[PDB]
Design a protein around this ligand. Structure first.
Ligand SMILES: *[C@@H]1O[C@H](CO)[C@@H](O)[C@H](O)[C@H]1NC(C)=O
Lengths: 462, 101
């Protein structure tokens, strides 16, 4: 059988023996060759190196060392800076490159030897806009971890030009977790709708600090554009009363996906996640799922490309790789499906813009799925009585409605008294009424506001 | 035989050359604005283009001095919003009506 090794450049760490992306790559590599369903007459192999993800020169060195040997494909690092150098090297030598974590793509860079399994942030931003349209919001507060968040989410920022929205963008300071000034500023603006554009670890941390600030009220609504929001411990938030909504691509509601996540949680028993950090345990991180799907679709493409003789392309001198064109084409229209649901590549760019999304909202139960988002269909939100309570609202005027003048605190509908109260009593004893008296929360009459026509009291209560 | 480097005027190319120069120790004296990743730990380099933090807040100073109420920012491509961050965050602390196009 054919033997091919996929050049891998993953994170170098010292606390954990090997990085989660490295675990995903190794697991999928040993799974594909083991399972004769994929690659029956071809044996898998790999070549994993370690970089700091910032010294792009050393990443280039590792990539050059890999290409000096036979490499089937390059699975570039998950950094927003070093990946550019690796993809440039791959394009120069005509070798396929498969990113997994999103990076900014220079619109003036004409490189056709790279793909990005991470859903394109333009599509995700459009989905966020569609969801906010479904929520009819007016005041929003977008927050980002890195400055790249502005690039990641721009469609919603432009939206107030298209629609009647309003934005107030604030930044999470670096090298700190002091969200308290940011949250205090949020209260000073009464920004009940807030969007958190940060990774799931930072999202969980800032959620913990918000709960410690008592930000889990019903009035506050949260959206987390990250795809690992499901992996947060919603146990303190199951009864917090938040209407939080989020997105998901890991199609956990599948037998094969459940088996894979269970096996992966079994494998990662060496470095358990810290329980006292607001993070769940035994779950598939979205980046690992993307790496899994990326290597699987590469395997699917090379299934249709049996002639996969590798070479020893150098960096001291450059030479085009003869198998790049058609193999990368097969990569581009490799329509395989896995943990992230549907996987396909927009042939115009290579960034996946057509992908399933699990719309996730928070209720009493933990992170229910309230529908599905698709690029073609936009947002797909689908989801008298004899013993009917007769709720009424009334204002306390002594000639009309006065509380029962009893020293003992009276309960039930008997505590209410007056002309209107007894008139309602007569209506209930004449007609069929399950009468109950509820005091008006506004305490004032319906006033025609010149600002927005906002009523109050009985009018806006009805 | 070199003792200094003047990198290209571009994000990715200058980033790569800066990393190479840091590894080799020679300075990489870039002359064009680029977005350094906030967690970058490189030293041997310097940029002369006015960083869009003092210049962005200078645009903010112009906005306040002109006393605008309805500002409509317009940019060129993705790496422009990441560059005028202070102007984007200004409406939180003041009265602005950014409708970005
Ligand atoms: C939308 O979701 C519903 C179930 O929630 C499903 O029956 C339907 O096929 C989906 N698509 C469309 C276009 O309605």
């Amino acid at each position: 059988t054919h033997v091919l090794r996929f050049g891998g450049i993953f994170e170098y760490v010292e606390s954990g023996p090997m990085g989660a992306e490295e675990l995903a790559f190794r697991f999928a590599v040993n799974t594909i060759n083991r399972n004769r369903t994929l690659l029956p007459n071809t044996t898998l192999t790999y070549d994993t190196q370690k970089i700091n993800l910032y010294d792009s020169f050393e990443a280039s060195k590792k990539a050059c060392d890999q290409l000096s040997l036979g490499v089937a494909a390059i699975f570039g690092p998950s950094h927003s800076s070093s990946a550019n150098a690796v993809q440039s090297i791959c394009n120069a030598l005509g070798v396929p490159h498969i990113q997994t974590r999103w990076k900014h793509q220079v619109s003036d860079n004409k490189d056709s030897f790279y793909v990005s399994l991470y859903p394109d942030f333009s599509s995700l931003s459009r989905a966020i806009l569609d969801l906010v349209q479904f929520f009819k919001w007016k005041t929003v507060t977008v927050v980002y971890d890195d400055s790249t968040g502005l690039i990641r989410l721009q469609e919603l920022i432009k939206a107030p030009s298209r629609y009647n929205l309003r934005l107030k963008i604030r930044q999470l300071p670096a090298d700190t977790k002091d969200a308290k000034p940011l949250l205090k500023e949020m209260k000073r603006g009464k920004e009940f709708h807030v969007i958190f554009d940060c990774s799931h670890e930072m999202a969980a941390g800032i959620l913990k600090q918000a709960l410690a600030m008592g930000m889990m009220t019903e009035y506050y609504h949260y959206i987390f554009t990250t795809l690992d929001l499901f992996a947060l411990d919603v146990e303190p938030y199951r009864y917090s009363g938040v209407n939080m909504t989020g997105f998901r691509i890991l199609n956990t509601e599948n037998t094969q996906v459940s088996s894979i996540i269970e096996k992966w949680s079994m494998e990662r028993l060496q470095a358990p996640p810290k329980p006292d950090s607001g993070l769940l345990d035994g779950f598939m991180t979205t980046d690992a799922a993307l790496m899994y799907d990326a290597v699987h679709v590469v395997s699917v493409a090379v299934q249709q490309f049996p002639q996969m003789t590798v070479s020893s392309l150098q960096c001291n001198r450059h030479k085009p790789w003869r198998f790049g064109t058609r193999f990368m084409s097969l990569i581009k229209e490799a329509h395989w499906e896995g943990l992230t649901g549907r996987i396909t590549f927009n042939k115009t760019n290579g960034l996946r813009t057509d992908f399933d999304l699990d719309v996730i909202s928070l209720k009493e139960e933990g992170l229910e799925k309230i529908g599905t988002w698709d690029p073609a269909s936009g947002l797909n939100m689908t989801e008298s009585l004899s013993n009917r309570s007769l709720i009424v609202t009334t204002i306390l005027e002594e000639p009309y409605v006065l509380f029962k003048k009893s020293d003992k605190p009276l309960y039930g509908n008997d505590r209410f008294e007056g002309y209107c109260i007894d008139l309602l009593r007569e209506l209930s004893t004449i007609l069929g009424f399950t009468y109950e008296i509820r005091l008006v929360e506004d305490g004032k009459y319906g006033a025609q506001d010149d600002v927005n026509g906002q009523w109050n009291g009985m009018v806006r209560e009805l």
